[PDB]
């Protein structure tokens, strides 16, 4: 039970760090006018389809 609580929260904090990383990576492109984001990064950061 305590091994489940640490392991299920370790994948939890990995998802939390992945979220924390995505928001700091993507917001510079979001907070800029003119739809700027490149192709490769759009796939890596899973922002649906294209630069729209």
């Amino acid at each position: 039970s305590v091994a489940s609580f640490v392991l299920l929260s370790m994948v939890g904090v990995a998802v939390g760090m992945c979220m924390c990383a995505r928001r700091r990576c993507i917001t510079p492109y979001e907070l800029t006018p003119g739809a700027t984001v490149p192709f490769l990064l759009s796939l890596i950061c899973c922002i649906r389809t294209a630069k729209a």
Binding site: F39, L43, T49, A50, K51
Partner: protein, 48 residues
């Protein structure tokens, strides 16, 4: 018969390896056709 019965559709012989030779042909022609479709799909999304 003093032995037990055969698996008939299972436990085919050594030198049935024709099955693996043709499956490693046709199944890789499928894998390559899906690889070709995935790489053209990938660049067609670069074309948005």
């Amino acid at each position: 018969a003093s032995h037990t019965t055969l698996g008939v559709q299972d436990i085919s012989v050594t030198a049935m390896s024709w099955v693996q030779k043709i499956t490693g042909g046709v199944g890789l022609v499928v894998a390559v056709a899906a690889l070709i479709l995935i790489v053209v799909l990938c660049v067609s999304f670069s074309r948005h």
